[PDB]
Amino acid sequence: NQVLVPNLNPTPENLEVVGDGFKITSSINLVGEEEADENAVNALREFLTANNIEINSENDPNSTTLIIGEVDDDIPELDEALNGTTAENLKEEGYALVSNDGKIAIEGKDGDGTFYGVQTFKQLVKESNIPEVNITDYPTVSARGIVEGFYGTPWTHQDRLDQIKFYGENKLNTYIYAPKDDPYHREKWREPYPESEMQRMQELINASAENKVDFVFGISPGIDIRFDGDAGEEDFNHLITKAESLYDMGVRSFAIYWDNIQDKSAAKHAQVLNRFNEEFVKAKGDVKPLITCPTEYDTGAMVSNGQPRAYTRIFAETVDPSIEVMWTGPGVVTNEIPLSDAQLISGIYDRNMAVWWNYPVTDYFKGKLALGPMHGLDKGLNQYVDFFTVNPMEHAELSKISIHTAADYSWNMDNYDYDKAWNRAIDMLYGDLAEDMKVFANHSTRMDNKTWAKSGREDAPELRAKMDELWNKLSSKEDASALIEELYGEFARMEEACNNLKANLPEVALEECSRQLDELITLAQGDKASLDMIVAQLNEDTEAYESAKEIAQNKLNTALSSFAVISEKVAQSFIQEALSFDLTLI
Amino acid sequence: QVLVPNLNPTPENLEVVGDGFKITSSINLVGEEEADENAVNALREFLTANNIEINSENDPNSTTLIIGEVDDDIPELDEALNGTTAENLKEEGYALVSNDGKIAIEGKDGDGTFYGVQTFKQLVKESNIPEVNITDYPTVSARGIVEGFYGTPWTHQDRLDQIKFYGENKLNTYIYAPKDDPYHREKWREPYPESEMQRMQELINASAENKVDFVFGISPGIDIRFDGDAGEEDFNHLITKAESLYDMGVRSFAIYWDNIQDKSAAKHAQVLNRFNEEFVKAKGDVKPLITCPTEYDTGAMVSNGQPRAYTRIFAETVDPSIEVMWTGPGVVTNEIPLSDAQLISGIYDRNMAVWWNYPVTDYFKGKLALGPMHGLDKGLNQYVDFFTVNPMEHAELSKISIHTAADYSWNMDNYDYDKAWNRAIDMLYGDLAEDMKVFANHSTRMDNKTWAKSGREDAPELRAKMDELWNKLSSKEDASALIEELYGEFARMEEACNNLKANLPEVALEECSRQLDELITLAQGDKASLDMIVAQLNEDTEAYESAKEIAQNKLNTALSSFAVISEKVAQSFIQEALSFDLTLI
Ligand SMILES: CC(=O)Nc1ncc(CN2CC3(CCN(c4cc(C)nc5ncnn45)C3)C2)s1
Ligand SMILES: CC(=O)Nc1ncc(CN2CC3(CCN(c4cc(C)nc5ncnn45)C3)C2)s1
Ligand SMILES: [Ca+2]
Ligand SMILES: [Cl-]
Ligand SMILES: [Cl-]
């Protein structure tokens, strides 16, 4: 009977169910349209239209009533429908939502809050039914988003527009434009963008404003920027001119990055930032705090023997307090940011830090897709961090899985459950293909280049535990029949799921993962043959063993030889384990 | 000035009370005719071997050595001890006092006096001895080896040498049970040939000489019959076989049920109980019967915290006096935590015996297990009164790990695996100790890639430095110093192994020469791996490709070979370096 609360992302801070729910009518009364946030109303109109829900011209008391507005708008209908629930005591971007007895109230703390209230409403409604809930909600972290800051083919204009919509839908409010292989960002940073590219930029800025996203325009001048004399003045004016060109199209957030460069002129880097902050940021008056990243940006690079290194010390002492400083954690690509690391670096800089999290980015190990949740990031990090971003894959569509979880982590940090969030991300993104995509993506969460880059949740941990249990059972001389049968089913399911994804995934997703799907099919076949080897030894069948051995070997060799990389420590490793296995040594 | 040298086992109580003194060219020996005969023989052997003559008449300028047991009333010994006593110590305990040209050795019993001599032997280095007060005794009552592996059994000469070695390190148990001796297992009814019976007599005599209990094992489980006239015949074959060894002096026996098809729990225990009644109790001077059930690891014995059917029936049936062996959580496993000992001890309602499967390598013969006792809980003596190790078929190189087992079993509470390991190589390899440490450090971790995993990780300090190299490179720090340090490390691996090839005695070298070559090959690959990194840092394509080919070839040779060493350190580093691309930083 009772209408259940569907999947929500981010998880709202406070949600109480206070009723059995109700069906929203074929047409609705909309109150507060003209006074409420324009972008919130546009998003609401889009949703209603897309779900065949008409807006009434005149009030119909038989129709459902939706009341929308901000706390500073005088809407008595909103106050009545809210019934004591308030948004005024909530932080910026916060909102209140109350659905009760054919009335939905949405009250933002501000215009951004009202917009995010609409996003929750959009997720609450399934087949015109809505639960009866009392919500007050607001972000843990002030700035939440993406930094397109990877090497490789930059995202297409269409990728970016789609990403911006997606960020709005999941309450992510920051998009930093800084692709390493854009010549006009970095290599040829002084040169103005072509008109065609400037028109694309304008479209991105408009889409960002439409979805409450701060478009942050990045510039990376550190390769060859000159600091002193007339050359210094010429180059600084190039930064201003470039920034001005994007300011004039609507950009109100800026980043100047010093990462991955030869030059470590600490004072000079900070002085360029301070001058830009004085002469541009403070000058314009409506520009958000300047963002940067120093040349030392991971703790290994920044700290030695618990003390800052020379560059970091000078940069920290020189750089203006208002400037947002990014760092990546203990390493460039690392397992965790524990609370002690954030404490250390925040202490050195004497400010709340910004995070450039290098997951799900795969530019260092392009064969594998990073399809796992936010993992290893301390749930108290908000104590020392006010700005959280992820560096995504060049593969924009499949980056959404990990980004979806980052929205949950950054908005509701204290209740973040990586496993539940990961499942929720695939459920909400893939729909009817969600269960099959889970089977595939479960094998492609761990990033490990075998040396310096290690991050993410382990691949297929439940399957790996069962594989370990097989070897233990065999050594203990127990009957492994039931476990072997279970594993045959697991490996069959991997093949079945991937074949269904090849047949039915939309091309936008399939074009990014087709080789990885084939890779996991090949490994699954090798895994099946690996079980055949074990069963053959148990039955003392040499012919059957040698036949299963050559298949297992061929499948492993193909997997190892191919560009695609997946399930290294689970599906791939199991074949190697099974090839080594000699039952006569038990 | 004179420091306390390496001791094994670590004595329970040791106090330094002086600057030490030089032992003279000749010595006065008091208590010869009253003291333990085996202790005196061991002492004479040591003195003779170190060119120390025994005075006929007392010389006051010569060092004096006074030896005896506590139950003897010997004033010369009491005076030199100066209040230190062995009377309140347990069995095998002793007191030793070195002070102002006098060394006093007092055993609680004959075994203690013997062990006192062993500590004395270790205390002396280049005729100098520290001035110390020692009281000392074992944690665990029965401490030793079970020759219970598959593969070529130890030679008669290997066994005689091992028995001496056990005496020297206060190990008191040697269980004869080699799987591939036909007369032990396959043809267990059949009598040993006279030539082999003479060799057994020699092992028994040597065991007595070194205070070792020779445990004669029989493994009848493959085809023993239990019921009717066939059951009587086969039981009498066990008695007959046991009797043959009893008549040469064997007073400890084992009947093992491991690694057999038959799981007739009640019948296994009934054979043991009948042997216990009709033989052990009958003879009256036979130590408790030792066994091992067919379910002997916790994975095989226990399901959902409760004993499995065989184990339940075996435990309820088997006589309380019988020592039951188990191997820990698995056959070859990382640890025996205290909870596992608790569980299994509780099931059997008795203190357990341990059959520890390290350093045995019969499941993965390519690698030598040269590491210390590792993962065994230091509280295990609560539930365990009998500790043994299954060694490698390689008897000489098994000494390294066995050395540490002597420390662990004698002084459990102060057991430090790292210190014990270093001490084992120092004490065994002498002038080659430093080089042998370099080699053996890479050959401690046993891992067959599936079910058998045990031992300390290989070369952990080097592995940490390799990790630090990758981190430094990613953090864009100057790695010059660390690269140079690693070049030194890899060069040292090659230098140490070549020296060991040239100078190790044949007895050791014949067991490890392939593994020495393996580590040399890996070290050469590791050097070439650094050359690859340096070539990328200098943007030298010619130098990179040259180093790459060498690294590739050395890796392949290492992988293809029978010999296995340093899989996660020296081997893995080459694979890591081949994967490394500096342009992706
Ligand atoms: C009670 C107990 O712990 N008893 C043991 N006894 C020998 C042990 C050390 N090895 C572990 C394995 C398991 C079996 N194995 C081999 C190797 C070869 C070369 N041939 C073999 N034939 C039949 N088994 N087996 C390797 C035995 S532990
Ligand atoms: C402050 C910060 O975190 N800034 C970053 N920016 C990009 C990031 C994610 N990737 C890790 C790597 C390390 C460098 N890298 C590549 C790849 C390729 C294909 N070409 C490259 N050329 C020079 N580097 N580099 C891989 C960058 S993290
Ligand atoms: Ca308004
Ligand atoms: Cl007991
Ligand atoms: Cl020799």
From Swiss-Prot, chain B:
One of its GO terms (biological process) is polysaccharide catabolic process. Changing N351A: No change in activity for 4MU-NAG. Its EC number is 3.2.1.169. Residues 141-413 form the GH84 domain. It is an enzyme of class 3 (hydrolase). It comes from the Bacteria. Residues 476-504, 534-558 form a coiled coil. Residues 140-430 are annotated as: Catalytic domain. Changing D362A: Strongly decreases affinity for 4MU-NAG. 99% decrease in activity for 4MU-NAG. Keywords: Coiled coil, Glycosidase, Hydrolase, Signal. Metal-binding observed in X-ray crystal structures is artifactual. This is O-GlcNAcase NagJ. It comes from Clostridium perfringens (strain ATCC 13124 / DSM 756 / JCM 1290 / NCIMB 6125 / NCTC 8237 / Type A). The gene is nagJ.
